[PDB]
Amino acid sequence: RKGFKFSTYATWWIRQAITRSIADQARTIRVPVHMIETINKVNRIKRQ
DNA sequence: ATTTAGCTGTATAAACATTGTGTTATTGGCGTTATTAAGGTAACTTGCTTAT
Numbered sequence: 859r860k861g862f863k864f865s866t867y868a869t870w871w872i873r874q875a876i877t878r879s880i881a882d883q884a885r886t887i888r889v890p891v892h893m894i895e896t897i898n899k900v901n902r903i904k905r906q
Numbered sequence: 907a908t909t910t911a912g913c914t915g916t917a918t919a920a921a922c923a924t925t926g927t928g929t930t931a932t933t934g935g936c937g938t939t940a941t942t943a944a945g946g947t948a949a950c951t952t953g954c955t956t957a958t
Contacts, residue, residue: 862949870948878944890942 881891 866950867948
């Protein structure tokens with residue numbers, strides 16, 4: 859009904875799924891996704 | 907015979923024993939705060955890497 863390309867709607871869902879999969883199976887020991895995101899933000903701040 | 911020394915008797919005394927009583931303490935319980943997971947989000951990027 860809205861006039862827009864479907865690629866962006868598909869892209870957001872694909873990106874969310876990939877990030878979630880990486881966090882869930884990223885390490886042999888399961889680590890919380892919220893804990894992982896804060897660690898990623900801290901690492902980016904340290905790099906800057 | 908007499909008593910004397912011997913013997914510890916059992917009450918008593920003392921110690922224990924038993925009873926009772928207090929105390930406390932911990933389980934349970936409840937709720938509680940730390941934690942946490944998932945859902946959802948939509949300009950666009952629509953056959954890869956990855957390698958002696």
